[PDB]
Amino acid sequence: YQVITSLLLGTLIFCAVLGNACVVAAIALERSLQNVANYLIGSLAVTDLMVSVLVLPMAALYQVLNKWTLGQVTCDLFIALDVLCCTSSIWHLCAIALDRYWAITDPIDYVNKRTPRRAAALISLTWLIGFLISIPPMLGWPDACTISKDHGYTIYSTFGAFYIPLLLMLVLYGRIFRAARFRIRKKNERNAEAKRKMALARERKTVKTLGIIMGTFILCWLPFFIVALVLPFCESSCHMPTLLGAIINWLGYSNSLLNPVIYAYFNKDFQNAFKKII
Amino acid sequence: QLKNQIRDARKACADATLSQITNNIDPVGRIQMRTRRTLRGHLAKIYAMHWGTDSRLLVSASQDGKLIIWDSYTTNKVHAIPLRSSWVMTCAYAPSGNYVACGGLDNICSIYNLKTREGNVRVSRELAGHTGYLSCCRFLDDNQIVTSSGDTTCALWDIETGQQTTTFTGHTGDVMSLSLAPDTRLFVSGACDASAKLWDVREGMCRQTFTGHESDINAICFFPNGNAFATGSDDATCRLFDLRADQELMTYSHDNIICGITSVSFSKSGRLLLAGYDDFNCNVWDALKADRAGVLAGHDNRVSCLGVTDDGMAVATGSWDSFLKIWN
Amino acid sequence: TLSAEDKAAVERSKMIDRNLREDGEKAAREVKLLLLGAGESGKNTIVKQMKITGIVETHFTFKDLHFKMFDVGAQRSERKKWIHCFEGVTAIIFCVALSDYDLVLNRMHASMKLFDSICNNKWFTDTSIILFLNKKDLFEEKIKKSPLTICYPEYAGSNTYEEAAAYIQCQFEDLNKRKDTKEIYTHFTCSTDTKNVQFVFDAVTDVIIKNNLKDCGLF
Amino acid sequence: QLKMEANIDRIKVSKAAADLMAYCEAHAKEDPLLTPVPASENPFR
Ligand SMILES: C/C=C\C/C=C\C/C=C/C/C=C/CCCC(=O)O[C@H](COC(=O)CCCCCCCCCCCCC)COP(=O)(O)O[C@H]1[C@H](O)[C@@H](O)[C@H](OP(=O)(O)O)[C@@H](O)[C@H]1O
Ligand SMILES: O=C1CCc2ccc(OCCCCN3CCN(c4cccc(Cl)c4Cl)CC3)cc2N1
Ligand SMILES: CC(C)CCC[C@@H](C)[C@H]1CC[C@H]2[C@@H]3CC=C4C[C@@H](O)CC[C@]4(C)[C@H]3CC[C@]12C
Ligand SMILES: CC(C)CCC[C@@H](C)[C@H]1CC[C@H]2[C@@H]3CC=C4C[C@@H](O)CC[C@]4(C)[C@H]3CC[C@]12C
Ligand SMILES: CC(C)CCC[C@@H](C)[C@H]1CC[C@H]2[C@@H]3CC=C4C[C@@H](O)CC[C@]4(C)[C@H]3CC[C@]12C
């Protein structure tokens, strides 16, 4: 039984590594893909590659063996690395949403004051938040090893890692949708009908894109954070099955490989660069 | 009558074509070339370049308004000249290297002095007077320059006086190309009229006329011997005309290639020819066997200019992707 | 490894490259516009309105946004041999004189042909076009003398300005074959100089926002 | 203009072709592009 799970986890990790490495290489080598917008995508791809090659194999080994056989300090290092990488990956989405909102709603700033230094500052801020979330549990402080279940620490981690960036991303994307709608709405009967049809098609495309972008992140991360928030506060109802926990954890981890598909493989210029490579 | 007489005279002397005699000549084979140096730094599409007589320094002109001189041996940038007009489409390098000329849509191709007591580049002369965009102005000497403009006229100017000493007229379409013979006594010109004209600098009157192209001529280059030249047009066919035979020798064409051409150059011995096509590629043809001999890829946009060194050590090709590739 | 002369050349090249990068970054913060139209369309009037021997370059700032406008109409030559140099411009401002509807160069037909050639050019597939109609008052005075049929035999309608201007705008906007890729903005020039500048700024802002939305994949 | 253009010497194209071949083969040994050059004297290495 363990063989099938190990093979599936290895295949998932291999696919994630291949996708992240391909995105990183395509962004690095290409000259037309060097801009402020693509720098955030490159940083996100690098972060997901780090997750795939540093966090995923050890978690897969733990799942396969159902126990930790690497030591307590190794488990602590694994927890630190996983928390930092996941927080950075989550905050990359918020940074990209903020950059897109600034570009769309402030054309003057986009033309004049938009520099790669802004992208570097955003990446540094995301890493700083990740560090400020990952350091405190070890700064202040056998066969199965889990994250500390302190109520205060759990609340702080969930609020500063998922809930606040989720709210910020939702607000920014709602404002972006409002701006896009405002721009879209703003013999001759045939021309009017064609204009209405094109406007409807643009609205449908925008709705589909926004729905996909929101739903992927929601389905990937929201249930796991809900479970992590609810479990420590009810010790008498911790009868949840191991299968559900494994499914939730791997669904959350799949966001690392799902992010490049949504954010990189769906771009016309990125796939054009890929065709140029071949 | 006179045109018919000239056509009859040129046709009656053609019974054997050089292409059939070249059959006995052995093929050159595949000439594999690789990029030796990658000159970068341009932030916009480049339009022209020139090679120095020392085969070490080269100068290029691009849309961003910077005229840059590179040392091909070490890739280092020697001089960068900020241009008043950013619409430059041509540049030239003096045989002595003291002056550099560049121009474009504006009716002036300014000449800048590189040897100054202050150690910095400065403008030396502005040549106003043309009523059209300057396709290319090439140095004839340290004090004389030949300029081809879009007003269907060419002009020979004295640098010291700034006034055009000689004027060449007769082309119906705008002249888009100009090449100088090694003897620096006579020059060819190519215009959109699908024809080429051979002029002589001294007496300034039309020496010869060649026809055969079916589209606008974009490139021209003299044969190293000086008795012939090659022309390229949008018809994707290269045509070699020799001044003494007054007739076409061969047409370089292929079924695969359909886009136009931008630059034509000859090797030191003249055995092989280099062409830059719009499909982000260069084709190396044999000037004798009239067959393809090599393909130079590696450019991400339309190839705009290319040039071989005086000694033939290497050839540098530029393109709209703002990168220059040196091949040996 | 490297001699003193070689090292000095390396530092000089590095300094030159840094200066060139800084200059390019500074120059990339300007909105480039290409001006086109017939010579007798009152180009100079709007030129001096917004600004206050080949390419004419006009630089002006408005609401913290810098615009560089390139006028090529000062020279006459083959368009298909130098228009590709203008690839990548933010917008093309086209000028049309309404009062030239009944002038034989036929002027309106030539303007329509030039607009058709420019709009459908492969180099300006993604380039927006901002249309300006000049001399509306003299057009209003002239239309009381001659009907539209002198220029449009296959058109029937009233001789009112409110309808004639709409008909001309529709005819000019019906020439494009890539309405999905590009949009045409039409404005009527008036004595108020700030109106044209505001319209140009709004059109440029809309074009930039639409390009950003397309890059984000929404539009 | 075309009246005086016809009053020029007219020769056969065979000798021009022979001259072109002679010029091509004379400088063939001094063509770096025609024959690949080793790194012993190649300055671009
Ligand atoms: C209500 C009734 C029921 C219906 C409701 C339930 C079912 C709903 C399903 C609806 C469909 C959902 C998915 C949509 C798929 C789809 O429409 O794509 C089509 C084909 O392209 C590919 O598929 C390209 C895919 C290839 C990507 C790479 C995959 C392989 C990579 C493996 C990684 C490892 C390799 C080494 C057309 O492509 P598209 O129109 O969708 O492309 C758009 C993309 O979706 C936008 O995101 C993108 O915006 P941005 O990325 O955010 O910047 C846009 O710019 C645009 O590119
Ligand atoms: O019984 C079993 C069986 C199965 C199993 C598999 C793997 C496993 O590795 C631990 C990894 C947990 C997932 N990380 C937890 C940390 N995490 C995070 C990041 C930021 C904020 C916040 Cl609040 C958080 Cl929680 C991201 C996701 C443990 C188990 N236990
Ligand atoms: C880990 C992976 C498998 C998760 C993938 C979830 C995707 C396939 C699901 C989850 C939510 C779904 C979206 C929810 C809302 C809408 C808005 C509607 O107007 C068009 C469809 C669209 C966009 C749905 C399409 C498919 C969707 C994006
Ligand atoms: C479709 C992709 C892109 C995203 C979703 C991946 C899901 C469907 C796959 C990928 C890896 C899989 C998991 C891998 C490991 C285990 C641990 C085992 O003890 C129970 C099943 C479980 C939990 C698998 C169930 C389904 C799973 C979570
Ligand atoms: C080792 C190399 C070969 C790995 C190749 C990975 C890249 C180049 C492959 C993997 C999946 C491919 C894409 C899958 C889906 C589509 C959508 C289709 O409508 C156009 C082509 C396009 C965009 C393909 C182009 C090339 C592609 C992006």
Swiss-Prot record, chain A:
Expression by tissue, per the entry, reads: Detected in lymph nodes, thymus and spleen. Detected in activated T-cells, but not in resting T-cells.
What changing K149A does, per the record, is: Increased activation of G alpha proteins in response to SEP363856-binding
Task: Place the motif NPxxY motif on the sequence.
Answer: 259-263
Query: Which residue intervals are topologically Extracellular?
Result: 65-73, 234-241
Could you tell me the membrane topology recorded for this protein? Multi-pass membrane protein
- Please list the disulfide bridges: C75-C145
How the protein is activated or inhibited is described as: G-protein coupled receptor activity is regulated by lipids: phosphatidylinositol 4-phosphate increases HTR1A-mediated activity. Binding to aripiprazol drug is regulated by cholesterol, which shapes the ligand-binding pocket, determining the specificity for aripiprazol. Activated by IHCH-7179 small molecule: IHCH-7179 acts both as an agonist activator for HTR1A and as an antagonist inhibitor for HTR2A. Activated by SEP-363856 small molecule: IHCH-7179 acts both as an agonist activator for HTR1A and TAAR1.
Residues in the Cytoplasmic compartment per record: 26-39, 99-118, 267-278
Q: Where in the cell is it found?
A: Cell membrane; Cell projection, Dendrite
GO BP annotations of the record are:
adenylate cyclase-inhibiting serotonin receptor signaling pathway; behavioral fear response; chemical synaptic transmission; exploration behavior; G protein-coupled receptor signaling pathway; G protein-coupled receptor signaling pathway, coupled to cyclic nucleotide second messenger; gamma-aminobutyric acid signaling pathway; positive regulation of cell population proliferation
Coiled-coil boundaries: none
Give a yes or no for keyword Glycoprotein in this entry: yes
The regions listed as transmembrane in this protein's record are 5-25, 40-64, 74-98, 119-140, 152-174, 210-233, 242-266
UniProtKB/Swiss-Prot annotation, chain B:
Effect of mutating G52V: In MRD42; decreases receptor-driven G protein activation; decreases protein abundance; decreases complex formation with gamma subunit; decreases trimer formation with alpha and gamma subunit
* Residue spans crossing the bilayer: none
Could you tell me the keywords of this UniProt record? Acetylation, Disease variant, Host-virus interaction, Intellectual disability, Phosphoprotein, Repeat, Transducer, WD repeat
Q: Where are the WD repeats?
A: 34-82, 83-128, 129-169, 170-211, 212-255, 256-297, 298-328
Read off the CDD domains from this record. Answer: WD40
Q: Which PANTHER family match?
A: GUANINE NUCLEOTIDE-BINDING PROTEIN BETA G PROTEIN BETA
**Oligomer and partners:** G proteins are composed of 3 units, alpha, beta and gamma. The heterodimer formed by GNB1 and GNG2 interacts with ARHGEF5. The heterodimer formed by GNB1 and GNG2 interacts with GRK2. Forms a complex with GNAO1 and GNG3. Interacts with ARHGEF18 and RASD2. Forms complexes with TAS2R14 and G-proteins; these complexes play a role in the perception of bitterness. Component of the TAS2R14-GNAI1 complex, consisting of TAS2R14, GNAI1, GNB1 and GNG2. Component of the TAS2R14-GNAT3 complex, consisting of TAS2R14, GNAT3, GNB1 and GNG2.
Q: Which family does it belong to?
A: Belongs to the WD repeat G protein beta family.
Mind telling me what this protein is named?
Guanine nucleotide-binding protein G(I)/G(S)/G(T) subunit beta-1
| Native source species | Homo sapiens (Human)
From Swiss-Prot, chain C:
Q: Which GO terms describe its cellular component?
A: cell cortex; centriolar satellite; centrosome; ciliary basal body; cytoplasm; cytosol; extracellular exosome; Golgi apparatus
Q: Which residues carry this modification: Deamidated glutamine?
A: Q75
Q: Which InterPro entries match?
A: Gprotein_alpha_I, Gprotein_alpha_su, GproteinA_insert, P-loop_NTPase
Q: What is its EC number?
A: 3.6.5.-
Gene Ontology biological process terms from the UniProt entry: adenylate cyclase-inhibiting G protein-coupled receptor signaling pathway; adenylate cyclase-inhibiting serotonin receptor signaling pathway; adenylate cyclase-modulating G protein-coupled receptor signaling pathway; cell division; cellular response to forskolin; G protein-coupled receptor signaling pathway; negative regulation of insulin secretion; positive regulation of cholesterol biosynthetic process
Q: Where is this region: G3 motif?
A: 67-76
Positions of modified residues (ADP-ribosylcysteine): C216
Provide the protein's localization: Nucleus; Cytoplasm; Cell membrane; Cytoplasm, Cytoskeleton, Microtubule organizing center, Centrosome
Q: Which SMART domains match?
A: G_alpha
Q: Where does GTP bind?
A: 40-45, 71-75, 134-137, 191
Q: Which Pfam families does its entry note?
A: G-alpha (PF00503)
Spell out the post-translational modification annotation for this entry. Answer: (Microbial infection) Deamidated at Gln-75 by Photorhabdus asymbiotica toxin PAU_02230, blocking GTP hydrolysis of heterotrimeric GNAQ or GNA11 and G-alphai (GNAI1, GNAI2 or GNAI3) proteins, thereby activating RhoA.
Q: What is this protein called?
A: Guanine nucleotide-binding protein G(i) subunit alpha-1
Species annotation? Homo sapiens (Human)
* Protein's gene: GNAI1
Curated annotation (Swiss-Prot), chain D:
Entry keywords, A to Z: Acetylation, Cell membrane, Host-virus interaction, Lipoprotein, Membrane, Methylation, Prenylation, Transducer
GO CC aspect terms: extracellular exosome; heterotrimeric G-protein complex; membrane; plasma membrane; synapse
Query: Principal localization?
Result: membrane
Tell me the part of the parent protein that is shown: 18 to 62 of 71
Give the range the annotation lists for the signal sequence.
none
Protein purpose: Guanine nucleotide-binding proteins (G proteins) are involved as a modulator or transducer in various transmembrane signaling systems. The beta and gamma chains are required for the GTPase activity, for replacement of GDP by GTP, and for G protein-effector interaction.
Top-level taxon: Eukaryota
Q: Name one GO biological process term.
A: adenylate cyclase-activating dopamine receptor signaling pathway
Its name, as the record gives it, is Guanine nucleotide-binding protein G(I)/G(S)/G(O) subunit gamma-2
Natural source organism = Homo sapiens (Human)
